[PDB]
């Protein structure tokens, strides 16, 4: 049939898949033993077919991943950590063993227990530490309760996006939470600049909440939540930071967009610097010979600056004083020469998220003629 | 869509009523209400996973 | 000769966790030098000491197919042995045996019979231990014989591990902060296996105190160089 | 009458492509066999001269 | 590559089937399906020892 020869070889399959998966969200939640699968074991689940008898029918995880499996149609690689059960809330979980170097971008924890949330926080912040192996993860957790409680039941962590919910919210909390994370991932896991807010870029699809008149957090409470932190719905996709080491105002690490772009710059500079391996870096005579591949610390700083002067506008913003924001000091330079050793260098930059749009106060004042 | 060479006796209550008709259609089974055919589909309702 | 440099512990090849890499071929006995010069020179003192400690762990082993066997013959007397009850040959397979001439005996000569039989004639006027390496259908194992000086007996030595570091062949050069040691690989090491060697070297200050340092290297048993 | 199952379908009909197939039986086994056969005119390990 | 003067008697079953073909296409041969020719290669598989 003109296909006998052997040149073309066609497979007409409806359920094909070409996408380069990426986008490796993890979902954590308690389970019912109906799910035939080893607990405390990361399982990169497929689409629905391998369902409730894989994680536990009925239990929170079921609905959570259902919403997640929902939302995003294509783009993510869903991962599940089906924790087991036991004022009960069996949450204990110091488990950097089961989940390890294999790194996940988005995290969603369907449990209002402060301890579990804080443990996830610690794990993420550990991943986000100066330690040379990096993957730059981010989590999403929910938090119900009254205004006083919501405020009190919080922290400084900027590695989560703790969602606030009034004690009237019809939908079961964790549900929305999952959806939120889901959307974010599948949306931003290629473009980090995007920010999930407004109506078009962020409306949770799988919610279908019953409409009413009395919304929830009144305007005052809305301001309280927003300023303080939480991502009251969606609008204001910030990460509760509100502070810093000592001085409170640290606008930089407020938006999630800022955090994703910072991770992007980190991985870009990491995959870029690797062209300075081998090389040979003269540091005493600062005079490379003729015919030998080599570089000098000053030359390296020049290269770094040139680089940081191209990604500007797209990753960084303006670099006010380039002469000071980017500094490269050699081991021998800082340390008075007794404890110096060629090979060690110190680079320090100044991240400035590209300024975005915000409120536009209007003061239209009518008159006649 | 006509099966002209069939010539079945006459209509009293042709086979599946409306309900059953719609049920089998949803289940992917062509129904022939000279019986004309309709929904000339095949018995395909789901892939490895995807139902719709 | 492998030559590695230690990190001087300033928080300044992580690979998988930290440990370095060392390729190795089955049967070889190579040498490694590690330079603590970067770590012990700023700590102006009396250099290193001869108190190294080595430890071998396997992260990929591929449990052996054939098994080993011992022997306790006497001096001058001929020894007889079989080689059929070693390979469990699970699925019906030819039991073709072989004695590689590269790893034959050390003070004797074997006589491989027709069906896994071998006759070991120890060297006249010789009392001690001897080994040889057989290959039962591609899979390699060792046979150890202890020739006894006709008085009573001789103790039992330990069957050599696939990857090892000799008992006393290590050295330290306090004038250059260099540790020398040997890496021995058994001919029974299966290609593709991966072992981990961890070292704990102690330097010393001018008053007699100690400074500990710990590192690893991942030894990859690879075939064909 | 225990209707026959002409399962084989390999040698009976080799790669001789037919657009339409008309099975005249109610044997679920026979139907399943024809189904499997036609599920070979749409595989990868063949020139796949199809047919429904 | 269509051998003109063969006028083979049209049939409905080949000789070498897909399997054995795929088999001796890795092994260099000049399998012929009138009958046309394809995979016009030589019986060359290996230089001195490095087969690929």
C-alpha dihedral sign at A29, A32, A34, A37? positive
Residue of E11, E13, E16, E36 best to disrupt the D interface, most CBs of D under 10 A: E13
- Chain A residues lying within 8 Å of E38, measured CB to CB: 5-6
Answer left, alpha or beta for residue A158, where phi above 0 means left and psi between -120 and 50 means alpha. alpha
CA distance A56 to C150: 72
Q: Does D8 contact chain E (CB < 8 Å)?
A: no
CA distance A106 to A183: 10
Q: How many CA atoms lie within 13 A of A354 on its CB side?
A: 14
CA distance E52 to E49: 9
Chains near E with 3+ CB pairs less than 8 A apart are: A, D
Beta-sheet strand order (sheet of C79-82):
C79-82, C117-122, C108-109
Bridge pairing between strands C108-109 and C79-82: unpaired
> What resolution (Å)?
3.5
Bridge pairing between strands A106-109 and A26-29: parallel
Q: Does A6 contact chain E (CB < 8 Å)?
A: yes
CA distance D46 to E7: 26
Tokens of C81: 């042995």
Q: How many CA atoms lie within 13 A of C152 on its CB side?
A: 2
**Burial (CB count <10 Å: 0-12, 13-18, 19+), residue A106:** buried
Residues 6+ apart with CB under 8 A from C40: C47, C48, C177, C203, C211
Tokens of C76: 């001058």
Nearest Cα residue to C136 out of C184, C186, C82, C185: C82
Per CB distance under 8 Å, which residues of B are interface residues toward A?
47-50
What are residue A143's DSSP bridge partners? A164
Tokens of C214: 């710990």
CA distance A140 to B37: 54
* A3, A11, A12: residue with CB nearest D47: A3
Beta-sheet strand order (sheet of A79-82):
A79-82, A26-29, A106-109, A138-143, A163-164
Nearest Cα residue to C123 out of C111, C108, C143, C139: C108
Q: Does A208 contact chain E (CB < 8 Å)?
A: no
Phi and psi (nearest 5°) for A325? -65, -35
Three-state DSSP state, A301? helix
CB contact under 8 A, A341 and C38: yes
**A60-69 vs A173-188: helix axis angle to the nearest 10?**
30
CA distance D50 to A1: 9
- Chain C residues lying within 8 Å of A338, measured CB to CB: 42
Residues 6+ apart with CB under 8 A from A2: none
CA distance A229 to C19: 42
Q: Strands, E, within A13-134: which ranges?
A: 26-29, 79-82, 106-109
Tokens of C185: 């690989």
Bridge pairing between strands A163-164 and C194-204: unpaired
CB contact under 8 A, E39 and A6: yes
Q: Does A368 contact chain B (CB < 8 Å)?
A: no
Tokens of E10: 């049209």
Q: In the structure, do chain C and chain B come into contact, i.e. share 3 or more CB pairs under 8 Å?
A: no
Phi and psi (nearest 5°) for A164? -95, 150
- Chain E residues lying within 8 Å of A5, measured CB to CB: 36, 38
Q: In the structure, do chain A and chain E come into contact, i.e. share 3 or more CB pairs under 8 Å?
A: yes
- In the A/D pair of chains, how many CB contacts fall below 8 A? 18
CA distance D19 to D12: 17
CB contact under 8 A, D49 and A11: no
CB contact under 8 A, A344 and C42: no
- By what method was this entry solved? cryo-EM
CA distance D49 to D41: 6
Three-state DSSP state, C35? strand
Whether A262 contacts A349, CB under 8 Å:
no
- The label of the residue with tokens 């290590």 reads C170
CB contact under 8 A, A338 and C42: yes
CA distance A346 to A335: 12
Q: Name the residue of chain E whose CA is nearest to A6's CA.
A: E38
Tokens of E1: 């590559």
Whether E1 contacts E41, CB under 8 Å:
no
Q: Name the residue of chain D whose CA is nearest to E12's CA.
A: D16
CB contact under 8 A, A132 and C14: yes
Whether A34 contacts A57, CB under 8 Å:
yes
Nearest Cα residue to A10 out of B44, C130, D48, C126: D48
Whether C120 contacts C134, CB under 8 Å:
no
- To the nearest 10°, the Cα dihedral for E8, E13, E14, E18? 150
Three-state DSSP state, A178? helix
Residues 6+ apart with CB under 8 A from A356: A195, A255, A257
Phi and psi (nearest 5°) for C181? -155, 175
Q: Name the residue of chain D whose CA is nearest to E13's CA.
A: D14
Question: Within 10 A of A213 (CB to CB), how many other CB atoms are there?
Answer: 4
DSSP secondary structure letters along A182-225: HHHHHHHTT-SS----SSTTT--SS--PPP-SS-SS-HHHHHHH
Q: Does C15 contact chain A (CB < 8 Å)?
A: no
- Chain A residues lying within 8 Å of D49, measured CB to CB: 1, 3-4
- CA distances from residue A147 to A141, A214, A217 in whole angstroms, order as listed: 17, 16, 8
- The label of the residue with tokens 């790194």 reads A103
- The label of the residue with tokens 């045996």 reads C97
Chain E: nearest CA to A10, how far in angstroms? 15
CA distance A252 to A355: 10
Q: Does D12 contact chain E (CB < 8 Å)?
A: no
CA C108 centroid distance within chain:
22
Whether A214 contacts A169, CB under 8 Å:
no
- Chain D residues lying within 8 Å of E12, measured CB to CB: 14, 16
Breaks following residues of chain A (C-to-N distance > 2.5 Å) = 86, 233
Phi and psi (nearest 5°) for E25? -120, -35
CB contact under 8 A, E12 and D16: yes
Residues 6+ apart with CB under 8 A from A188: A194, A196, A260
- The label of the residue with tokens 């000569």 reads C109
CB contact under 8 A, A11 and D47: no
Nearest Cα residue to C121 out of C108, C107, C104, C132: C108
Answer left, alpha or beta for residue C192, where phi above 0 means left and psi between -120 and 50 means alpha. left
Three-state DSSP state, E6? coil
Within chain A, where are the H helices? 60-69, 114-127, 147-152, 173-188, 219-228, 256-273, 297-308, 322-325, 331-334
Question: How many helices (H) and strands (E) in chain C?
Answer: 1, 14
Chain C: nearest CA to A232, how far in angstroms? 41
Question: Within 10 A of A47 (CB to CB), how many other CB atoms are there?
Answer: 14
Q: Name the residue of chain D whose CA is nearest to E22's CA.
A: D45
Per-window interface: C 23-82 vs A, CB < 8 A: 38, 42
């Amino acid at each position: 049939d003109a296909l006998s020869d052997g040149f073309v070889r066609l497979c007409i399959d409806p359920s094909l898949n070409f996408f380069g998966e990426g986008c490796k969200i993890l979902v954590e939640g308690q389970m019912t033993d109906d799910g035939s699968a080893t607990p405390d074991a990361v399982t990169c689940v497929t689409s629905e077919l391998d369902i409730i008898e894989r994680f536990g029918q009925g239990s929170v995880l079921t609905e959570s991943l259902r919403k997640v499996f929902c939302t995003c149609k294509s783009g993510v690689s869903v991962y599940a950590l089906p924790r087991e059960d036991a004022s009960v809330n069996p949450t204990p979980n110091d488990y950097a063993t089961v989940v390890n170097e294999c790194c996940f971008a988005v995290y969603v924890l369907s449990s209002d227990d402060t301890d579990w949330q804080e443990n996830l926080r610690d794990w993420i912040r550990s991943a986000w530490d100066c330690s040379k192996p990096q993957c730059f993860g981010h989590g999403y957790v929910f938090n119900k309760g009254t205004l006083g409680q919501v405020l009190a039941d919080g922290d400084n962590s900027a590695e989560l996006s703790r969602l606030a919910l009034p004690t009237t919210y019809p939908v079961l909390p964790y549900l929305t939470n999952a959806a939120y994370g889901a959307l974010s991932a599948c949306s931003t896991c290629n473009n980090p600049e995007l920010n999930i807010q407004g109506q078009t870029f962020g409306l949770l699809s799988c919610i279908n909440m019953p409409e009413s008149c009395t919304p929830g957090w009144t305007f005052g409470e809305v301001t309280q939540l927003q300023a303080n932190g939480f991502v009251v719905s969606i609008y204001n996709d910030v990460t509760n930071y509100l502070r810093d080491e000592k001085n409170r105002p640290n606008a930089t690490f407020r938006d999630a967009s800022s955090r994703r772009l910072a991770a992007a710059t980190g991985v870009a500079l990491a995959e870029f610097l690797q062209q300075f391996n081998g090389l040979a870096v003269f540091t005493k005579n600062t005079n490379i010979r003729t015919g030998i591949i080599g570089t000098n610390p000053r030359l390296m700083l020049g290269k770094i600056r040139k680089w940081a002067q191209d990604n500007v506008g797209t990753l960084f913003s303006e670099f006010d004083n380039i002469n000071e924001d980017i500094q490269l000091l050699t081991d021998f330079e800082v340390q008075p020469k007794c404890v110096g050793q060629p090979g060690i260098f110190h680079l320090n930059m100044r991240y400035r998220p590209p300024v975005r749009g915000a409120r536009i106060n209007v003061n239209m004042a009518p008159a006649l003629f | 869509g006509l099966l002209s060479c069939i010539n079945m006796p006459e209509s009293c209550t042709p086979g599946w009523t409306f309900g059953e008709v719609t049920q089998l259609q949803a289940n992917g089974f062509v129904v022939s209400g000279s019986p004309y055919i309709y929904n000339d589909v095949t018995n395909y309702l789901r892939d490895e996973k995807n139902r719709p | 000769m492998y030559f590695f440099s230690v990190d001087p512990r300033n928080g300044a090849v992580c690979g998988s966790c930290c440990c370095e890499s060392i390729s190795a071929r089955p049967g070889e006995v190579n040498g490694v030098m590690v330079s603590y010069a970067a770590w012990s020179a700023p700590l102006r003192g009396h250099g290193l000491t001869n108190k190294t400690t080595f430890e071998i762990d396997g992260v990929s082993v591929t449990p052996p197919k054939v098994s080993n066997a011992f022997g306790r013959t006497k001096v001058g007397v001929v020894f007889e042995g079989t080689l059929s009850d070693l390979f469990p040959n699970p699925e019906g397979e030819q039991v073709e045996y072989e004695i590689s001439e590269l790893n034959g005996p050390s003070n004797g000569v074997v006589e491989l019979g027709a069906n896994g039989a071998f006759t070991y004639t120890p060297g006249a006027l010789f009392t001690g231990v001897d080994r040889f390496w057989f290959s039962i259908n591609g899979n390699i194992g060792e046979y150890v014989i202890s020739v006894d000086p006709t008085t009573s007996e001789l103790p039992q030595p330990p069957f050599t591990t696939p990857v090892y570091v000799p008992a006393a062949r290590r050295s330290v050069d306090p004038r250059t902060h260099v540790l020398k040691f040997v890496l021995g690989v058994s001919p029974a090491a299966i290609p593709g296996d991966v072992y981990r060697l961890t070292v704990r070297q102690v330097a010393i200050d001018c008053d007699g105190n100690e400074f500990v340092h710990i590192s690893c290297y991942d030894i990859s048993i690879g075939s064909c160089g």
